[PDB]
Amino acid sequence: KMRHLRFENLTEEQLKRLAKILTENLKGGEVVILSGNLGAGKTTFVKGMIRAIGLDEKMVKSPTFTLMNVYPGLKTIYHLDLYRLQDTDFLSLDVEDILEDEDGIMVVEWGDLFDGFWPEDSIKVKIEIADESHRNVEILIPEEVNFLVEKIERYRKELQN
Amino acid sequence: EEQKMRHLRFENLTEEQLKRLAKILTENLKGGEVVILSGNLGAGKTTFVKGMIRAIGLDEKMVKSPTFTLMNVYPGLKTIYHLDLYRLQDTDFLSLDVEDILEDEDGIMVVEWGDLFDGFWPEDSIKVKIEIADESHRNVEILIPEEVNFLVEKIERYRKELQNT
Amino acid sequence: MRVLGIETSCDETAVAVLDDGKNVVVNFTVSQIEVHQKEVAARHHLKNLPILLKKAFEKVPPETVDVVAATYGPGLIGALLVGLSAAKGLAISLEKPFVGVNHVEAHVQAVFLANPDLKPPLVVLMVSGGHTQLMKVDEDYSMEVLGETLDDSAGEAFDKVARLLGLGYPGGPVIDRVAKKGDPEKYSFPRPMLDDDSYNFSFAGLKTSVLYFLQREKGYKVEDVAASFQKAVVDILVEKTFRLARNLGIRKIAFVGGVAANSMLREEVRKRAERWNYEVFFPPLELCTDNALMVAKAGYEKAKRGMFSPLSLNADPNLNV
Amino acid sequence: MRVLGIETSCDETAVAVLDDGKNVVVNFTVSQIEVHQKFGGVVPEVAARHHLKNLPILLKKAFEKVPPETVDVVAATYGPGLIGALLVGLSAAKGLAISLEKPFVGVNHVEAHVQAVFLANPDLKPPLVVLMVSGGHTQLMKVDEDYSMEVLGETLDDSAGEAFDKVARLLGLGYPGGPVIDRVAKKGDPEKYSFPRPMLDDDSYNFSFAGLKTSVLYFLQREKGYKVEDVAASFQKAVVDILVEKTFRLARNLGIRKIAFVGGVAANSMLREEVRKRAERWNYEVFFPPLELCTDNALMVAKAGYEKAKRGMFSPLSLNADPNLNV
Amino acid sequence: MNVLALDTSQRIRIGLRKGEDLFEISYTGEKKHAEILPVVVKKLLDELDLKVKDLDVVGVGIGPGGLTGLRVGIATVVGLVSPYDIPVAPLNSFEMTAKSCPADGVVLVARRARKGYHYCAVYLKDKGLNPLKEPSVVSDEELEEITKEFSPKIVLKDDLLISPAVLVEESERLFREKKTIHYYEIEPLYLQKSIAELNWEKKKRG
Amino acid sequence: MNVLALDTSQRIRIGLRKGEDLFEISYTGEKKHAEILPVVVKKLLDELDLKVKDLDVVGVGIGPGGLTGLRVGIATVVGLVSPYDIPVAPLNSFEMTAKSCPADGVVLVARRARKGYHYCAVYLKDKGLNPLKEPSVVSDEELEEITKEFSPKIVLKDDLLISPAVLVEESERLFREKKTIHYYEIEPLYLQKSIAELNWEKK
Ligand SMILES: C[C@@H](O)[C@H](NC(=O)OP(=O)(O)OC[C@H]1O[C@@H](n2cnc3c(N)ncnc32)[C@H](O)[C@@H]1O)C(=O)O
Ligand SMILES: C[C@@H](O)[C@H](NC(=O)OP(=O)(O)OC[C@H]1O[C@@H](n2cnc3c(N)ncnc32)[C@H](O)[C@@H]1O)C(=O)O
Ligand SMILES: Nc1ncnc2c1ncn2[C@@H]1O[C@H](COP(=O)(O)CP(=O)(O)OP(=O)(O)O)[C@@H](O)[C@H]1O
Ligand SMILES: Nc1ncnc2c1ncn2[C@@H]1O[C@H](COP(=O)(O)CP(=O)(O)OP(=O)(O)O)[C@@H](O)[C@H]1O
Numbered sequence A: 001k002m003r004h005l006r007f008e009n010l011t012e013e014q015l016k017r018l019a020k021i022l023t024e025n026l027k028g029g030e031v032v033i034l035s036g037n038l039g040a041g042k043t044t045f046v047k048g049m050i051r052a053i054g055l056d057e058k059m060v061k062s063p064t065f066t067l068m069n070v071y072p073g074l075k076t077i078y079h080l081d082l083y084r085l086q087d088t089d090f091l092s093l094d095v096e097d098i099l100e101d102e103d104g105i106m107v108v109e110w111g112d113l114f115d116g117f118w119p120e121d122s123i124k125v126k127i128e129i130a131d132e133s134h135r136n137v138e139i140l141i142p143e144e145v146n147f148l149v150e151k152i153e154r155y156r157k158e159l160q161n
Numbered sequence B: 001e002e003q004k005m006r007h008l009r010f011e012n013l014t015e016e017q018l019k020r021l022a023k024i025l026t027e028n029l030k031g032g033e034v035v036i037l038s039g040n041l042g043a044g045k046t047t048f049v050k051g052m053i054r055a056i057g058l059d060e061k062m063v064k065s066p067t068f069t070l071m072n073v074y075p076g077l078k079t080i081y082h083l084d085l086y087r088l089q090d091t092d093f094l095s096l097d098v099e100d101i102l103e104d105e106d107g108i109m110v111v112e113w114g115d116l117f118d119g120f121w122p123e124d125s126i127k128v129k130i131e132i133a134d135e136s137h138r139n140v141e142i143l144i145p146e147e148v149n150f151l152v153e154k155i156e157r158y159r160k161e162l163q164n165t
Numbered sequence C: 001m002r003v004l005g006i007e008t009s010c011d012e013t014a015v016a017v018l019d020d021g022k023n024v025v026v027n028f029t030v031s032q033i034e035v036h037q038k039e040v041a042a043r044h045h046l047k048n049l050p051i052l053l054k055k056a057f058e059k060v061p062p063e064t065v066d067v068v069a070a071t072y073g074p075g076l077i078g079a080l081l082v083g084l085s086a087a088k089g090l091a092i093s094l095e096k097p098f099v100g101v102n103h104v105e106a107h108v109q110a111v112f113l114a115n116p117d118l119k120p121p122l123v124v125l126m127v128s129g130g131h132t133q134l135m136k137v138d139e140d141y142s143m144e145v146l147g148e149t150l151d152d153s154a155g156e157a158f159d160k161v162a163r164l165l166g167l168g169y170p171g172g173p174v175i176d177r178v179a180k181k182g183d184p185e186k187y188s189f190p191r192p193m194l195d196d197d198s199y200n201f202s203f204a205g206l207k208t209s210v211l212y213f214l215q216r217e218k219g220y221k222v223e224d225v226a227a228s229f230q231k232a233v234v235d236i237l238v239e240k241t242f243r244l245a246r247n248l249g250i251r252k253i254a255f256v257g258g259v260a261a262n263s264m265l266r267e268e269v270r271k272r273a274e275r276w277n278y279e280v281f282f283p284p285l286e287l288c289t290d291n292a293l294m295v296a297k298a299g300y301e302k303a304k305r306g307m308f309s310p311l312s313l314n315a316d317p318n319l320n321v
Numbered sequence D: 001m002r003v004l005g006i007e008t009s010c011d012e013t014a015v016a017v018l019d020d021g022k023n024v025v026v027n028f029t030v031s032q033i034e035v036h037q038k039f040g041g042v043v044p045e046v047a048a049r050h051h052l053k054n055l056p057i058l059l060k061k062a063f064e065k066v067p068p069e070t071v072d073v074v075a076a077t078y079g080p081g082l083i084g085a086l087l088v089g090l091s092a093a094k095g096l097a098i099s100l101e102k103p104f105v106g107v108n109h110v111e112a113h114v115q116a117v118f119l120a121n122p123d124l125k126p127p128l129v130v131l132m133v134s135g136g137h138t139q140l141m142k143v144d145e146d147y148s149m150e151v152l153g154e155t156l157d158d159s160a161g162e163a164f165d166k167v168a169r170l171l172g173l174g175y176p177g178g179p180v181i182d183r184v185a186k187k188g189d190p191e192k193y194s195f196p197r198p199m200l201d202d203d204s205y206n207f208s209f210a211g212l213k214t215s216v217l218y219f220l221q222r223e224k225g226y227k228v229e230d231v232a233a234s235f236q237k238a239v240v241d242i243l244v245e246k247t248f249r250l251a252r253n254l255g256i257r258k259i260a261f262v263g264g265v266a267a268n269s270m271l272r273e274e275v276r277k278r279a280e281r282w283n284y285e286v287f288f289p290p291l292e293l294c295t296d297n298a299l300m301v302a303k304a305g306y307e308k309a310k311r312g313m314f315s316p317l318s319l320n321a322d323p324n325l326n327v
Numbered sequence E: 001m002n003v004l005a006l007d008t009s010q011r012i013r014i015g016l017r018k019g020e021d022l023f024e025i026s027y028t029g030e031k032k033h034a035e036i037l038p039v040v041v042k043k044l045l046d047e048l049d050l051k052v053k054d055l056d057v058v059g060v061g062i063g064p065g066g067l068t069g070l071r072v073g074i075a076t077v078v079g080l081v082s083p084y085d086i087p088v089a090p091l092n093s094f095e096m097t098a099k100s101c102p103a104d105g106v107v108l109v110a111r112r113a114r115k116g117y118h119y120c121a122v123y124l125k126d127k128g129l130n131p132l133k134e135p136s137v138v139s140d141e142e143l144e145e146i147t148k149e150f151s152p153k154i155v156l157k158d159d160l161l162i163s164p165a166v167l168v169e170e171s172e173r174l175f176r177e178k179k180t181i182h183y184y185e186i187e188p189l190y191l192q193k194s195i196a197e198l199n200w201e202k203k204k205r206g
Numbered sequence F: 001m002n003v004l005a006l007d008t009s010q011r012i013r014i015g016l017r018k019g020e021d022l023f024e025i026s027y028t029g030e031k032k033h034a035e036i037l038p039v040v041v042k043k044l045l046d047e048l049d050l051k052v053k054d055l056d057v058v059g060v061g062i063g064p065g066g067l068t069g070l071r072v073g074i075a076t077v078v079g080l081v082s083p084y085d086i087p088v089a090p091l092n093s094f095e096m097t098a099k100s101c102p103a104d105g106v107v108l109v110a111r112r113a114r115k116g117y118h119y120c121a122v123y124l125k126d127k128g129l130n131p132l133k134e135p136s137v138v139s140d141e142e143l144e145e146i147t148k149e150f151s152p153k154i155v156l157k158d159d160l161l162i163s164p165a166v167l168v169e170e171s172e173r174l175f176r177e178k179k180t181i182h183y184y185e186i187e188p189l190y191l192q193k194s195i196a197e198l199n200w201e202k203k
């Protein structure tokens, strides 16, 4: 039971600005699954999100090889890219351990892989590529977190009209 | 005057005979108990303590009248505790200091002039009156409550070994 | 001076013992405990490393070890904390010093090994997957990141633009291989952050440019796209390395990393060095520039200078020069 | 060089400060803050021999006077004494060192009661013999030019003091025994009875006194009709006798002219008389304390402190107390 | 005996026997495990004035808890004992926590893992410590089921204290009983793994 | 803030806190108290770059236990703080023992004293420590009579385990509630004094 919130043809600017709005209205030990294909604009999303925690965009980079980058800010964002993941033990051990921290925000380029692993209450963010310079995005907000929907919705009708 | 515990009297013990049995009385006990030496000045209380210091594996040359020290403390197989309360004023030394030794259930307490404060010592306490006969030979009455037993057998045993020689 | 060096940063869990930073006494690596023993698994450090100490101390007597080196950054906290936490405790039980290796410092070093008589005023470009970067190496051997990608490694660009082109793994070898057939001056793909006051790169620019063409367009040759895009990566690289080797004034230039290996890089770099008269450098044939020999060496030179680390030293997974 | 020192060996609790040796800037004691305890009222009070309750106050008064900053060494009786009584002064003293970042000295009350000879005669060559005869001890010692002192004589049984105290009670006279025995032995015949001299013409320097205590116990059990001062003076001479012949036949045989006395037994009228006589007639140099029995305050230990510190002979913090301790 | 037990399961816990001397030291503060564990080991050895080849056996908390902690604890133990194949006593961090409670009867040891599950086991403690429920991942609510059923006299929740004395006493006991292992033979108790299956079959139930 | 605390009531428990850092140390075994304590305090303060004059509060176990144990402990404390009147926090050794036990419940603390009698208290561990039965002495029968009544979860008998993290917490608390005292105001709980009374009143 969870509200899907679609955003149609978004500028590279507005994309980051949605990400910053999600991420400042977060509270604790929260998973943001980032679903999207090569080029979608996931990493660019996280660029927008890190704004919220008082660090600079410039320290966001494909964790495709690093696997995890950690932005220790107003909250500490852990950033995963599963593109390269070979050992599922990283999830069963390392990522299970990351999940025990309840004052910090996880976010996962390709968290739509290994679906069984992630939580019921995880926030899902499909990013799609409708244009050379625009991307369409759908934020799914599990009902145990409706405190977001008001705040995000504002920006849905703040853009449309 | 009247302690209906158990008599175990001797008679005309040479100086050496007295140390020898004192050696039997202490070598027949594992930790925890208290021994109250009585008898007037020069009876052989201190001298008796020399018999006991054999059982813990020391020579007696370090047993000395502890009258101003209050507690000479002799370590061995059991750490033997030696007290002369001849010269005591502050009873806070029993309240506190002697009490905090009774907590040690592994070692042996022995007290010249214990009968002086009688009734501060626990009921399960052994007595050793040292009366005096020849200028060389002494009589000694070991006591043992109902709390203690096995000794009254072991004592009256040795009586034989070196009283028929 | 036997250094006992420990690897828990790479995926091969490695232990080595190296007298005087030259003669190698024993090299054990889990990788080589599988067909020489044809369990103990890919990169399961805390399970593997024990067996390699077992294998090392059966051959090397424990005394003889003079320094214990072990990488502390960059890598993954969990991986790092196993070689490092373990090497610290060797030090304790050997009554010997321990040295934390900075991996990318150590990587840059073996350049000075691939030629003993190579003088150390020199500019390194590091073009891996994990890393894309220009540096100074001062005559004293003091390094600084001057150039750094802001988004993607050249390594990552290659691997995904390969994926986009329906080409195999690995990324670069395949694109290198199949651009040989193509026309690198065929599509005018963007060269982000060229002709600049910055010494920095972006690449996510390209990956998208290619993807947008692949989507919009059709009828196109794959080679030709592959060649067109490899040149646009080589133009941005080859320009910056030589703009900066000039701008500060160096003639000897080192190329470390996987992208290093690229025939069109090595060919274009070469027609710059053969024409301004510069000495140009590459790593060894069977690139495993990543063993415990690496960190033993690293930690030898360190100890050589009595530059030791304290038992308080934490891993830094984001460690650079 | 301010050296703080602490007594806690038996009955007396004392703290003292001492500047380069005998230059006293405090010698506080439970004994002198007892007469000054009827003054205004009574609240922050000292018991009597309650070392733990007391040492805290004594220290307080002292640091109100002497800013601790200026204490340079700390020293406390380590032994001999009552393990309990000692562990207070000792343990505190080590703490005082830990707090103030100043080094620690665990003193010998003996090496101390002997150094107190030099506090009363600074002009005193130290190649001397000393007889310690308290209740606690009955000993002969030798102090080197060095000042290092081995014990050479020792009672095997009771002290001179203990024999005086007890034979007193046998004759039903006051405490402390000795003084009373001395005072009454004056109007009595020192040779009316001949008791033993246990260990006289014996080829060692070691004392016995359990032989006397009884040979009187025997005497009174036996004999009715006899003067008390006869027995007193007799028994007393039996002791002066054995003391003087041991003391000298050692000062002589170890080739030494000079010879000092210590212990309330030192107070004895008959002892002094006959020591004086012998040393007038061998030209040997005898000494004594005055007549002010205060052989248990902190000025001693403060000094052994200044003395062992000037010699950089310092103490470790592991340092236990030693009740059964001598030199 | 000379014994070094540690447990870096939760906060840092270190026991050290030299013959007839038992030292226990525990650090609870901001500093990470790798910042501080090894340091203390060095200092504590350098103080009892004994070296590692003097140690007769070394205990290690291997059992259920914080990953980065255990990975460090087991690693530094491997570092120490490896040169001299010193015998290792694997210590179950829960079993420890339980023996470190001073009591009699039914014990639940629990530590909150992920989002909505616990690591949990249940222990009958007369004398020898006998296991009712063996340590395992359960849900927030399967915990309240486990509580009522086995019905504890004692619950040790999330902030679990461990007596380093107890670590040693067991390390000693396993040495004596011949149940020590070589530092190559350790296997940590990573309950973290068994969470991700319980998840798959809670999203399946729809 | 900066806090030392120690109990010598049974064995050496020393806890030091320097703002962010809390070390706990316990020594057990042969070495006598005066041998180990002063030494471990010195070595410890040293390692934390911490002079005594910088402690906000020092806590001391005074509570029922072994004399020469406590004597050493207190005195040692009195030496550290005497020169800068550093506030002393008294600490009850049974209260400190009960507050170390993980369990909440009715929790008996009892200490085989003079060979036929026990030191003894019964605490209710809830929000704080609700004091049911005050520290006092009892007979071997009078202990069962207690244990019959309050029928307690935890028998903390004979091996009184005191966590030092506890002693610190308490000191830290007592400093805040102004419940601290001076180095000359220290007053140990010598239950022992109250065993001669209840035995010279039995024979
Ligand atoms: C942190 C660590 O992971 C990183 N190392 C690393 O990423 O692996 P490395 O071997 O240096 O580089 C691998 C990359 O090197 C590229 N590569 C290999 N051969 C190539 C070729 N002929 N042409 C273009 N790229 C090539 C591959 O596509 C691959 O992405 C580092 O050096 O920091
Ligand atoms: C350990 C300590 O107790 C011992 N001091 C001691 O016992 O108190 P002291 O003040 O040194 O001497 C006590 C003894 O000195 C004896 N005494 C005092 N005046 C005497 C006199 N005029 N004639 C004979 N004996 C005397 C007393 O009978 C008593 O036994 C010591 O200083 O070693
Ligand atoms: N409206 C838009 N939204 C997002 N990115 C946009 C955009 N318009 C252009 N872009 C470009 O998209 C690129 C972002 O790349 P990334 O965020 O790295 C894609 P990613 O999802 O991380 O791909 P990956 O699957 O390879 O990791 C940049 O070149 C950015 O400028
Ligand atoms: N049969 C005997 N048994 C014991 N001692 C004997 C003895 N015959 C003679 N003696 C002597 O009696 C003396 C007793 O001396 P101690 O025992 O030292 C004094 P005490 O009897 O303890 O009493 P006190 O403490 O009141 O002075 C010794 O010198 C000892 O040699």
Ligand SMILES: [Mg+2]
Residues within 6 Å of the ligand: A042, A043, A061, A062, A063, A064, A081, A109
């Ligand atoms: Mg990305």
Ligand SMILES: [Mg+2]
Residues within 6 Å of the ligand: B045, B046, B047, B065, B066, B084, B112
């Ligand atoms: Mg006697």
Ligand SMILES: [Zn+2]
Residues within 6 Å of the ligand: C103, C104, C107
């Ligand atoms: Zn590298």
Ligand SMILES: [Zn+2]
Residues within 6 Å of the ligand: D109, D113, D295, D296
């Ligand atoms: Zn004296």
